[PDB]
């Protein structure tokens, strides 16, 4: 009963060592100081923070707001499915275990070898071949943050929302390392780029290139490995298909 | 400095668009977002100087 609750806002700028330009959500913006004991180094622009409702001072930082869709896709239990429950995938399951998990165990091994840990891999095959279950088992063995995402569920009529969702997915992944991005049915997003010009496929190309940037773009990726399963590997975009 | 300090402690005045000078003492003015009021005019401001659709201070 002695707590009064707090505003929530986003830090816009570090005006000086003490004055922080902070925008409250769906409201006005202020210049506000921070608490006496706080990690100003972690008060990066865009960092969601809390504000004392009376004195309007930076109270405590908050982890980045997560999209409800991303939250829902992020909190489905893998069900601790065991590697015994796969069936006859020994060489491929070993290869996948290598390319995903080994960077999550001995990066020193790779760096002494000198390779950059792999960013991710594609798992192509006919339907019912167990790609979803295989990835679920990989997550369960890892017991890490799992993002079971199906591509057909992120295309939207709202024009800039699909790429925004991809950005939110990858921002969540960067925030919650170690995370596993399992993008099922990737043929519904990366289906080659062509200039026929219909609006729908054009928006699909925009989403694909947003994925390509979020995946091997300017911002280098650390400790985030992706799994993309499809039934038509041959229609994938060459830019996405590239190493 | 003292005069500026004194005048700096008084609250700001809402700007508003005068709909019309209703009477010689009352002026219908719309101020965003409170709505529209019929305010009075202090001694200094002359009504005839108040024209419709001019920004005034309340």
């Amino acid at each position: 009963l002695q707590s009064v609750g707090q505003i929530v806002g986003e830090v816009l700028k570090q005006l000086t060592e003490e004055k922080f330009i902070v925008k409250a959500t769906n409201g006005p913006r202020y210049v506000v100081g921070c608490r006496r004991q706080l990690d100003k180094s972690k008060l990066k622009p865009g960092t969601r923070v809390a504000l004392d409702m009376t004195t309007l001072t930076i109270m405590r930082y908050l982890p980045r707001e997560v999209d409800p869709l991303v939250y829902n896709m992020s909190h489905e239990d893998p069900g601790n499915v065991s590697y015994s429950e796969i069936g006859g995938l020994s060489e491929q399951i070993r290869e996948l275990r290598e390319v995903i998990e080994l960077p999550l165990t001995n990066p020193e091994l790779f760096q002494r070898v000198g390779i950059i840990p792999p960013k991710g891999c594609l798992l192509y095959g006919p339907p019912g071949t167990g790609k979803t279950l295989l990835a679920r088992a990989v997550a369960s063995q890892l017991d890490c943050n799992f993002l079971k995402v199906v591509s057909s569920s992120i295309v939207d009529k709202y024009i800039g929302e699909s790429a925004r969702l991809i950005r939110e997915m990858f921002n969540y992944a960067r925030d919650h390392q170690p995370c596993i991005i399992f993008m099922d049915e990737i043929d519904a997003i990366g289906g080659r780029r062509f200039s026929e010009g219909t609006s729908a496929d054009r928006e699909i190309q925009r989403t694909l290139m947003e994925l390509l940037n979020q995946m091997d773009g300017f911002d280098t990726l650390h400790r985030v490995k992706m799994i993309m399963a499809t039934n038509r590997p041959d229609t994938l975009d060459p830019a996405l298909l590239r190493p | 400095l003292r005069e500026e300090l004194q005048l700096l402690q008084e609250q700001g005045s809402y700007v508003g668009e005068v709909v019309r000078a209703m009477d010689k003492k009352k002026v219908l003015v719309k101020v965003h977002p409170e709505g529209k009021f019929v305010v009075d005019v202090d001694k200094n401001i002359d009504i005839n100087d108040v024209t419709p659709n001019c920004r005034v201070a309340l």
């Binding site: - | 709909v19 719309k30 709505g35 009021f37 019929v38 305010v39 009075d40």
Partner: protein
């Protein structure tokens, strides 16, 4: 109710060669304006009349307080309490003081309320928010039916729709036909729809309201329909009146299932416009005029016979109408004797009234290029292809 508006000064426009008949008439007008100025300055010079009641008015003002907020009387209850909405959108169950005119209280009329403990303390019959005040025409446009060339059928129809009911309407109820509530002009751009609206607003005897269509749409929730309601309420209050909504397709497009909030608000605003169009009886003396270029894109409910019976067509001018427009716009020019103007008209093209006006303007500019003002026929020759920018040659012969 009150009376109409849109006062205008003398037509003048009987002479144009600046032959001092203009000067004499204008001097008479100026003399009358001077007597206006002097008379009112004298009347304000001596006019002692004030106080009288004072005390009762002073105490009623004290009761009202200062400031007083205006709201919309959305609904009434037993004759001491009512429901009033502030301009924000919040409405409250408030009390009604004795000194209010209980006959004036009706759903919609603006009510003066107390700033604290809201309570109806007055009624304002002239709210007329600045936007709708702007849409009301004050100075009649200088254009008139003399300036309109051709469109004789169109002028006939528009006068039979908006003037004949305003003037002697006995023919209408004598035949028993209800007057045409609302008229939509349409046609290719620059045919003369807005010009005809101007001419109507000139030779008028009713409050003329000019609207842009896109003007009605407003950012805030419910502001759109509220403004449309205010416009039509002003139309009824100052009836007889003519409500001209230019570019009706700014809102008149086909109604479709709205998804976003903004499109829902646009649908609400058009629904309110249609409801207001249905609200007043056609026997009422308020008419609407809507002009557009893309008639085919309008909702086929706005143009229903039960809502807008008439549909005036503004086709591209014919050769005789083309020469009429050329004569009209060349009236103020000092054309030479060599000019014929017939070659331009005879050329099979799609000239419009705007195109012909621009051709005349460009011919004048070409004449000014040669330091002359008599404007040869060669000036028009050049101007025609100067302003007319943009079938494969011998395919059709």
């Amino acid at each position: 109710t009150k009376g109409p508006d849109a006062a205008s000064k003398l037509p003048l426009v009987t002479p144009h060669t600046q032959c001092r008949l203009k000067l004499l008439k204008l001097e008479r007008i100026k003399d009358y304006l001077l007597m206006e100025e002097e008379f009112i300055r004298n009347q304000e010079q001596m006019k002692p009349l004030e106080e009288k009641q004072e005390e009762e008015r002073s105490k009623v003002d004290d009761l009202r307080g200062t400031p007083m907020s205006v709201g919309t009387l959305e609904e009434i209850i037993d004759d001491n309490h009512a429901i009033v909405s502030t301009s924000v959108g919040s409405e409250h169950y408030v009390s009604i003081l004795s000194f209010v005119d209980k006959d004036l209280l009706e759903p919609g009329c603006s009510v003066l309320l107390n700033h604290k403990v809201h309570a109806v303390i007055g009624v304002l019959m002239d709210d007329t928010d600045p936007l709708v005040t702007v849409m009301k025409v004050e100075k009649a446009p200088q254009e008139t039916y003399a300036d309109i060339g051709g469109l004789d059928n169109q002028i006939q129809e528009i006068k039979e729709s908006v003037e004949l009911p305003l003037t002697h309407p006995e023919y209408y109820e004598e035949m028993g036909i209800k007057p045409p509530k609302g008229v939509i002009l349409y046609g290719p751009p620059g045919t003369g729809k807005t010009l005809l609206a101007k001419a109507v607003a000139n030779q008028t005897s009713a409050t003329f309201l000019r609207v842009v269509g896109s003007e009605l749409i407003q950012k805030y929730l419910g502001d759109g329909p509220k403004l449309v309601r205010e416009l039509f309420r002003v139309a009824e209050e100052h009836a007889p009146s003519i409500v001209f909504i230019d570019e009706i397709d700014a809102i008149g497009t086909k109604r479709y299932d709205s998804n976003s909030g903004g499109e829902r608000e646009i649908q609400r605003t058009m629904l309110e416009l249609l409801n207001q169009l249905d609200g007043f009886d056609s026997r009422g003396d308020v008419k609407v005029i809507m002009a557009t270029n893309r008639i085919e894109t309008l909702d086929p409910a706005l143009i229903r016979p039960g809502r807008i019976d008439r549909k005036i067509e503004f086709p591209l001018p014919d050769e005789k109408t083309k020469k009429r427009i050329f004569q009209i716009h060349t009236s103020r020019m000092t054309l030479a004797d060599d000019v014929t103007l017939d070659d331009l008209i005879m050329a099979k093209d799609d000239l419009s009234g705007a195109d012909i006006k621009a051709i005349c303007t460009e011919a004048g500019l070409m004449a000014l290029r040669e330091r002359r003002m008599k404007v040869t026929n060669e000036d028009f020759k050049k101007s025609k292809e100067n302003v007319l920018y943009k079938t494969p040659e011998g395919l059709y012969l």
